[PDB]
Design a protein that fits this description.
part of a larger assembly; 7 chains; A alpha+beta; B alpha/beta; C alpha+beta; D alpha/beta; E alpha+beta; F alpha/beta; G mainly alpha; C: alpha+beta; 3 helices; about 10% strand; E: five-stranded antiparallel sheet; globular; cytoplasm (chain D); ribosomal protein (chain D); Ribosomal_eL18 (chain D); Ribosomal_uL15/eL18 (chain D)
RNA sequence: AGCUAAAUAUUGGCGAGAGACCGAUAGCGAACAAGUAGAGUGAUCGAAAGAUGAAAAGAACUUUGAAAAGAGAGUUAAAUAGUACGUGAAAUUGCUGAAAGGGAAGCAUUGGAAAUCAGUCUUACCUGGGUGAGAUCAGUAGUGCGAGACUAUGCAC
RNA sequence: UUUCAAUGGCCCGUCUUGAAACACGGACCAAGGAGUCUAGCAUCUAUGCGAGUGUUUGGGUGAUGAAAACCCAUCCGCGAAAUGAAAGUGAAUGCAGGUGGGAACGCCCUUGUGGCGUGCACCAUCGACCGACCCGGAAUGGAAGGGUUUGAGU
RNA sequence: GAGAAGCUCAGACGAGUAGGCAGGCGUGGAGGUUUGUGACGAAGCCUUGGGCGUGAGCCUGGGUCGAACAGCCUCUAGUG
RNA sequence: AAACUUUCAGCAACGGAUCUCUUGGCUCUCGCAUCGAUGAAGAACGCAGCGAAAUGCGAUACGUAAUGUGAAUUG
């Protein structure tokens, strides 16, 4: 059993919880779902559609957490569908290598490696301490 | 509808030309503010509105029974897709399985505490928390017309036998309980949006086959009813396009982008 | 976002709105049978036309090359984490002082420019 | 100033189906790719007919399909029949031949009779998989002018068309203007 | 959720009934909860207020103020309490009204009718 | 609905689509369909010929129940029997022939159109056309009249 | 005037028809009231059957003579053949129709 | 010659439950002492008019004035809520400030003068150079059968 | 943003061939203010089913709480047969016919605006069948033979 | 990858009353959704400040204010 | 150079728009059937400690008897 990912995208392309669309700037759209890394509303980036999807989130108090969709046999098991790897407090290079290895070198999603690394870098730069100027 | 006599309960006639006044009818007599004022016009204060609303306006809309069953079947099928539930906003990230079926002992529940405990154990209580947090006062004048509060929709419990499950689950905010034999589209696709979180009982899930039947078999509880046939056998167009049967016969891929 | 050129900076005021106070400044197309603005006689006011449209690349862009994305809470600022170089954050006018401070601190952490900051 | 007459400027063809069916859009997407990446006019014809309206896609019957593929000089013995539309049943045909039919949708009775007779029913995506270019395929259409509106279209003097009548019988447009005994006959 | 046919959830009707209730109904409307000791003794949660009832204010600016109910202004839905006043410009002490639900009774004015009401509610003696 | 109506787009246009010369006055050619012989004759004679006049006899107090006689053709006679009856008799060789009661199916007369299988069949009907009876006899069946 | 396609108009609305417009907003209420009324009658006349036994008759005319429907009451000859008096048939719930005859 | 329940109607009266209706020029004419005030001999005609404040706590007292009131005060979270009272637009008006003006003014294009606003530029990844300190890195070893990825234990100091 | 200078700029709406008009309305401002609803019809489009189609006239789950949603039977409406005023009659010679153009497909020639074979839809046309009319027409019946015709037919 | 409702390249063209069509802006109410805004100040109003859109309009800074209000997908109308 | 006129802005006026509410209206549904010569509907005149309009009442007059609640009415 498998409901088509193309069918799911057609249903949720314009109406779903994680889409933030606004008529400003000619109708911009943003995707906020946890298992999407690009941040834009597209079928190739929608993790609710793609069987194999990746996502990067901030981790408390530091580091990032990589969310990946497991084997499609867990499609009807949402509790077993998502695997979360909390990257420890490692250097930026170590984090990039770990993400690149777990995403691209394993054949999972070779096209999302650059996006995942960039998002991880942005999260780390956001988590860095603030040198307040008084 | 407005009153039939609204705007007509005055005695007024037009004064004609030569009085340096608009030819709209005016109230006769004297000794009061209403005297000499215009009436009977949609542009006049305390007059008659343009095209007064009638009660015999068509309020109800008829739908073919086959179309209604098609919509209900699509809503039930959509409820079994985990991505659609997340799309509709149901917090079902940590629930064990979609569709979610519980034991028939739930139908014999007697307390809201038991119902809440079951929801927390099957990880469905996050929807209840979402509904409780989302409860807010309505924006606009609907709060003056017995519609003060608005909130989100929670899980839809479907049962076969009522032994206390309805009373146990009814007080939980956002939770709607319905019998399997009378599934409602307004609850299965609230707001016209598919992907409602539904919790079935064992008996209700087992009776779903007899309620809807199949494409080739007739439904036991719906006479001469068959499930609709789809116009596409496999809706994975990307797989069909990238399959060997097509890629082996297509011409040169061509340039996806051409330099200026 | 680079070399932004405005074809016109005038707001296309409505005809005779200066003459009469009941006539609003919002543009309305003159449809009179003897209207001179509609016929575009020399010396009259200009009418909005599709030819005045700005370049698609530079359209909707602030003079700094960014686009003012409205933010009402912290989550709206997190929406701009990846689009740091194209979208700036405009805090909604109905946001309280506490939430405004939180939004500013989150945008500063994310490196997102804020238009109505301070 | 340039003196150019603008007569055939805007094309009067659909570039997208009016229907909002998601599965129909999926079929359109598949055959958009097929028409672009193949040099077969069959794929272009299917894509064009996918955009057409309900009136422009008349239904066809299994009797009509059987009659068209069982002509003496036909040689359409085992070829697959493709129609972009609904295939209806004809109860007047007591015995159904073995037919391979591909269509948008099938009537329940027609599909059951085809399967019982030993034939096969395919969707358009299945037809695309089996015959990516439409080889050995009999492409058919329903009768476009078989609807009620074409009985009245073109009504006028000496046109022999059906008038729009509230009822049927005498006292209903069967008088002066319709026979010689009453002034004139049309 | 209300299910009875004789119960109205209309805001208009509910407000009309509350603001138009007669004195007998307003007596029941102006009810105050009993103290923890009173609840554990009489097995009653709340009771309609009465004159010479010992109460302490729970909410409002006059928190912690104990005293007896000087008068029960049922027309204004207010309780006038002893020594709970505010000074005026001329020096007169204008009493300050407190809602019956904003105070808790610490000692009841127990008469024969009050005792009957307690037993009717299900209270012990 | 109202939001997709032409009135919402006609807002701001003075004449509301009815023109500045002819306007949208009250009935300028009369009410209803009056004038079909004098000033609407050009429309009546070209689009509704035969409207004016008398043709035929009058029948006082016509009742359609005695005139009730729906018709069915030969190529649908075998569709009136159940599927099991068709599998038992159609195309087979049995000592008895199936009986098709057209009146019970809801028809008054049997008309001759289309073809019939060579298997014999008994047709019960109030009326039957000559061609229908001939084709049924050719197929081997018989027609017995009922009331 | 008439200048568009289609059949000529035939609207019968030249009277004050808006005064006598009948709405069906009370249809579910009427259905509930009738259901409650027959439930009340069933409880009142229990254990007697809610509906009396009716004879089987052939509807008149050639359009409906091939069907069988329910009649009003049994004829006197039918009651005599069944050994039931007409004065006792009503008591035991058997309707009597003096107009109908057995041809 | 005659009687007869039910299914049927119900813009009147009484009671009740509701609304994808109107939110004070709307909705009944009437949300308020409304068929009231008021007009006509009469038949009849027939309005306008809701909101301080949580609580009057509705401004004690002093001073000026014949008084009305003003100024100090006082109450209040608020008197930018004082009963002429929720907020408080426009038309219109007074004071102050700026500018212009030889029988109209208003507008459009361009620039001048005056006034006002925008930049945080050079941030950020990365690296050259100095020192401090650090549980320490490449290749590895053990802990899913080939290739590859990641985590963990140790070596590599 | 204000103002100055240069240049240009007639008061809007309306009827009208023609308005700046010595043609009409407009002293100012706020609020209100005019293609709506219903019974039909016609074209087009979408949806479901399809020689069928329409559950809501009605009945039941129904008491709980049910103006909703869900289920259910017999009539009936429209369509499946037309023609004639009517009595009446009532649609296959054939592969449900032939001819021309004709989508798609298949086979060749070699690059052609190429030939061969069927041929969906649609149009034009020659026929065949049903009803009406005009015939001959070998008490009642009009079976075969026809026709310069006629029908909103097959 | 670029909302395949997408991306990319190239050419030609652009007056308009009556009138036709399409795509959009704005208003009241309804369903769905946004751990949506808000007494640490919602709506409204004023503004000699700022920004976006050809435009209908929208966002924002400052002042007043005191209780509700909004974005997106649909439904609807006593909607400019 | 003032005064005067015009525009804008800040305060102060005139006015009551906008916004938010609403014991009101309108509409629908459900249930019921009860005026009068034993004097109806309606009209007039009076009744309270301070009461003119409204509600209530009738010289037993914002009312008596009886019944129920149980400490108020309130300026």
């Amino acid at each position: 059993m498998s409901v088509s990912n193309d069918l799911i995208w057609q249903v949720i392309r314009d109406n779903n919880r994680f889409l933030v669309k606004r008529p400003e700037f000619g109708g911009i759209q943003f995707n906020r779902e946890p298992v999407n890394v690009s941040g834009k509303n597209a079928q190739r980036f929608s993790g609710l559609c793609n069987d194999k999807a990746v996502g990067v989130q901030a981790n408390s108090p530091r580091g990032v957490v990589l969310i990946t969709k497991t084997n499609p046999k867990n499609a009807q098991k949402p509790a077993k569908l998502f695997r979360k790897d909390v990257i420890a407090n490692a250097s930026s290079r170590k984090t990039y290598k770990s993400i690149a290895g777990r995403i691209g070198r394993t054949g999972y999603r070779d096209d999302l490696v650059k996006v995942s690394v960039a998002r991880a870098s942005a999260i780390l730069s956001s988590q860095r301490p603030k040198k307040t100027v008084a | 509808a407005v009153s039939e006599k609204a705007g007509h309960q005055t005695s007024a006639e037009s004064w004609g030309t030569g009085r340096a006044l608009a030819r709209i009818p005016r109230v006769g007599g004297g000794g009061t503010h209403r005297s000499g004022q215009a009436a009977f016009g949609n542009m006049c204060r305390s007059g008659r509105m343009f095209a007064p609303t009638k009660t015999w306006r068509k309020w109800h809309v008829k739908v073919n029974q086959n179309e209604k069953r098609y919509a209900i079947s699509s809503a039930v099928a959509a409820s079994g897709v985990p991505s659609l539930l997340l799309a509709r906003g149901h917090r079902i990230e940590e629930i064990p399985e979609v569709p979610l079926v519980v034991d028939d002992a739930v139908q014999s529940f007697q307390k809201t505490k038991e119902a809440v405990a079951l929801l927390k154990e099957i990880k469905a209580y996050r929807d209840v928390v979402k509904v409780a947090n989302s409860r807010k006062l309505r924006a606009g004048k609907g709060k003056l017309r017995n519609r003060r509060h608005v909130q989100r929709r929670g899980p839809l419990v479907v049962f076969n036998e009522d032994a206390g499950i309805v009373k146990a689950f009814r007080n939980i905010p956002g939770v709607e309980i319905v019998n399997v034999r009378r599934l409602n589209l307004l609850q299965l696709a609230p707001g016209g949006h598919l992907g409602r979180f539904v919790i079935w009982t064992k008996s209700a899930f087992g009776l779903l086959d007899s309620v809807f039947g199949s494409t080739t078999e007739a439904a036991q509880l719906k006479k001469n009813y068959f499930l609709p046939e789809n116009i596409i056998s496999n809706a994975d167009v990307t797989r069909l396009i990238n399959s060997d049967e097509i890629q082996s016969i297509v011409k040169a891929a061509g340039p996806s982008r051409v330099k200026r | 976002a680079v070399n932004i050129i405005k074809k016109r900076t005038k707001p296309f005021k409505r005809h005779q709105s200066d003459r009469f106070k009941r006539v609003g400044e919002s543009w309305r197309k003159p449809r009179g049978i003897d209207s001179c603005v509609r016929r575009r006689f020399r010396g009259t006011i200009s009418m909005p036309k599709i030819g005045y449209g700005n370049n698609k690349k530079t359209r909707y862009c602030m003079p700094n090359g960014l686009k003012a994305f409205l933010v009402r809470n912290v989550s709206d600022v997190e929406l701009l984490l990846m689009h740091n170089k194209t979208y700036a954050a405009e805090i909604a006018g109905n946001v309280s002082a506490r939430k405004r401070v939180e939004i500013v601190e989150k945008a500063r952490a994310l490196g997102v420019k804020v238009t109505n900051a301070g | 100033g340039i003196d150019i007459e603008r007569h055939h400027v805007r094309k009067s063809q659909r570039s997208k189906p009016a229907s909002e069916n998601v599965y129909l859009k999926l079929l359109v997407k598949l055959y958009r790719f097929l028409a672009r990446r193949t040099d077969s006019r069959f794929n272009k014809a299917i894509l064009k007919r996918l955009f057409q309206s309900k009136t422009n896609r008349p239904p066809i019957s299994i009797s009509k399909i059987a009659a068209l593929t069982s002509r003496k000089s036909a040689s359409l013995e085992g070829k697959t029949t493709v129609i972009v539309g609904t295939v209806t049943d004809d109860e007047r045909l007591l015995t159904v031949p073995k037919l391979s039919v591909a269509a948008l949708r099938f009537t329940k009775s027609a599909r059951a009779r085809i399967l019982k007779a030993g034939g096969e029913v395919l969707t358009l995506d299945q037809l695309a998989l089996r015959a990516p270019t439409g080889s050995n395929t009999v492409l058919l259409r329903g009768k476009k002018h078989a609807r009620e509106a074409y009985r009245h279209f073109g009504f006028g003097p000496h046109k022999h068309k059906a008038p729009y009548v509230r009822s049927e019988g005498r006292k209903f447009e069967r008088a002066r203007g319709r026979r010689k005994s009453r002034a004139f006959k049309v | 959720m209300k299910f009875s046919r004789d119960v109205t959830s209309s805001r208009r009707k509910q407000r009309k009934a509350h603001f138009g209730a007669p004195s007998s109904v307003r007596r029941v409307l102006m009810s105050a909860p009993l103290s923890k000791e009173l609840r554990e003794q009489y097995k009653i949660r709340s009771l309609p207020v009465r004159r010479d009832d010992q109460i302490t204010v729970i909410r409002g600016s006059n928190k912690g103020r104990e005293g007896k109910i000087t008068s029960v202004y049922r027309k204004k839905f207010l309780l006038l309490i002893e020594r709970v006043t505010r000074e005026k410009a001329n020096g007169a002490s204008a009493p300050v009204g407190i809602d019956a639900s904003k105070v808790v009774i610490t000692k009841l004015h127990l008469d024969k009718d009050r005792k009957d009401l307690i037993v009717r509610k299900g209270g012990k003696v | 609905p109202t939001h997709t109506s032409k009135t919402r787009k006609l807002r701001g246009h003075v004449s509301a689509g009815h023109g500045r010369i002819g306007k949208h006055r009250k009935h300028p050619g009369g009410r209803g369909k009056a004038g079909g012989l004098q000033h609407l004759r050009s429309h009546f004679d070209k689009y509704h010929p035969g409207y004016f006049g008398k043709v035929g006899m009058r029948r006082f107090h016509l009742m359609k129940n005695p005139l009730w006689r729906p018709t069915v053709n030969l190529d649908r006679l075998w569709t009136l029997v159940p599927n099991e009856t068709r599998e038992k008799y159609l195309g087979k060789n049995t000592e008895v022939a199936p009986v098709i009661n057209v009146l019970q199916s809801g028809y008054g007369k049997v008309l001759g159109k289309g073809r019939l299988p060579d298997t014999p069949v008994i047709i019960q009907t109030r009326y039957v056309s000559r061609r229908a009876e001939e084709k049924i006899k050719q197929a081997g069946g018989v027609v017995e009249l009922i009331a | 005037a008439i200048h568009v396609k289609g059949q000529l108009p035939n609207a019968h609305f030249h009277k004050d028809w808006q005064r006598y417009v009948k709405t069906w907003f009370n249809q579910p209420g009427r259905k509930l009231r009738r259901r409650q009324a027959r439930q009340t009658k069933a409880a009142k006349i229990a254990p007697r059957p809610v509906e009396a036994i009716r004879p089987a008759v052939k509807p008149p005319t050639i359009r409906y003579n091939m069907k069988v429907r329910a009649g009003r009451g049994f004829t006197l000859e039918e009651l005599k053949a069944a050994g039931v008096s007409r004065r006792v048939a009503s008591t035991i719930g058997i309707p009597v129709d003096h107009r109908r005859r057995n041809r």
